[PDB]
Amino acid sequence: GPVTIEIGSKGEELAFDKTELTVSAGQTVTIRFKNNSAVQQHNWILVKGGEAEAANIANAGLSAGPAANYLPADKSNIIAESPLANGNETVEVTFTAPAAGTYLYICTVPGHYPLMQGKLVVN
Ligand SMILES: [Cu+2]
């Protein structure tokens, strides 16, 4: 059944406060991402592919800029995107969990990846 998963920045660090999440395939998941920094922007992006695909997406975001959520307009390897969260802001994204497997979630704000990453486990 539908669930919310709470996640945030690890305070002022370039890290999520949870490095792994477990859901069921097909489950309705609302990610409620709380920016616990007053001075960073962050997002939570669930991607398809390995760390190489993550790095590619983040790298594209450098020249995409904030109005495009530091993301490419090509969504072939993006499963879900949080809105961009400014200082002290909470944002949400609701998505249907993908097929069973493990997926990376990353932040594409310039410079935060590769440190700012975690893993979604779908059973
Ligand atoms: Cu970030």
Give the Cβ contact number of residue 59 at 10 Å: 14
The Cα–Cα gap between 21 and 32 comes to: 13
> Look-up: residue for tokens 């594209």?
60
Question: Domains of the chain, with CATH numbers?
Answer: 1-123 (2.60.40.420)
Question: How many Å lie between the centroid of ligand 1 and the Cα of residue 123?
Answer: 27
Numbered residues of the known binding site:
42, 107, 112, 116
Numbered residues of the known binding site for Cu cation:
42, 107, 112, 116
Q: Please give the torsion angle defined by the CA atoms of residues 111, 104, 118 and 62, in that order, rounded to the nearest 10 degrees.
A: 10
The DSSP symbol for 37 reads: -
CA-to-CA dists, residue 52 to 42, 48, 77, 81, 115, angstroms: 20, 10, 11, 18, 14
The Cα–Cα gap between 7 and 72 comes to: 23
Experimental technique used to determine this entry: X-ray
The Cα–Cα gap between 34 and 67 comes to: 20
Give the Cβ contact number of residue 52 at 10 Å: 8
Q: Phi/psi class of residue 49: alpha, beta or left (left: φ > 0; alpha: ψ in -120 to 50)?
A: left
Amino acid at residue number 15: A
The Cα–Cα gap between 47 and 39 comes to: 25
3-state helix, strand, coil in the chain (%, to 5): 15, 40, 50
Question: How many Å lie between the centroid of ligand 1 and the Cα of residue 106?
Answer: 8
The answer to whether residues 54 and 106 touch, using CB atoms and an 8 Å cutoff, is yes
Residues with CB under 5 A from ligand 1 (ion): 42, 107, 109, 112, 116
The answer to whether residues 70 and 81 touch, using CB atoms and an 8 Å cutoff, is no
Could you give the residue ranges of the DSSP H alpha helices within the chain? 51-64
Three-point CA angle 34, 18, 88, nearest 5°? 15
CA max distance for the chain? 38
The Cα–Cα gap between 88 and 34 comes to: 7
Q: Identify the sign of the CA torsion 53, 65, 119, 97.
A: negative
The answer to whether residues 92 and 32 touch, using CB atoms and an 8 Å cutoff, is yes
User: Token pair of 102, please?
Assistant: 């493990």
